[PDB]
Amino acid sequence: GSMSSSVPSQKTYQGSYGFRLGFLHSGTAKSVTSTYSPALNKLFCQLAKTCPVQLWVDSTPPPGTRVRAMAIYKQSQHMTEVVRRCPHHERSSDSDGLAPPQHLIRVEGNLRVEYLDDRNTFRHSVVVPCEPPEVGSDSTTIHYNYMCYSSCMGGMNRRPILTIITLEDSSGNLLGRDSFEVRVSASPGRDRRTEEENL
């Protein structure tokens, strides 16, 4: 376990541009590879499958704006432990060539992706340029991939995580923040349906 001496803020912050996340409304059929529970504010997804996350604003942010994703453990007693891939998957060398093998969160389909091992906090994050919607689209979507199961021993080790999405300007200053819980499992639709029944 790499231990950090800080914890990233999780405070929701729409900021000047009205930043917030959206998710597809995918339902809980057996065939779904990712599904989002609004009641739990929790994303359920399969290992290394595309998770679309929409980025919404009310006004266009300045040029060079970027969007960063970072995972932390949800439980207070684990929050200072850096979220990382388990030993097996890190050594599996399943990298797309861009992502460090230790990083839990990847972005797919974006050649401008940038990965950070923070030299002071030791936290991992992934950042991409933030684009307005393309011609013929009404949304900006990032395709995230979670590269370990929540049950991966020596990684998340059955502990729940939060993903924190931050909108930043070109200089790294905070423009907006949103977050959601994540469970990575082989049966996201069933797992979402079950957890919502336990409400």
Ligand SMILES: *C[C@@H](C)C(=O)n1cc(C)c2c(-c3ccc4c(c3)CCN(C)C4)cncc21
């Ligand atoms: C970097 C991302 C957050 C960004 O600059 N961004 C995302 C979105 C969705 C967006 C818009 C935008 C907002 C709302 C609508 C539309 C575009 C298109 C039409 N529908 C109805 C609403 C604008 N600028 C930037 C931006």
Ligand SMILES: [Mg+2]
């Ligand atoms: Mg929300």
Ligand SMILES: [Zn+2]
């Ligand atoms: Zn793993």
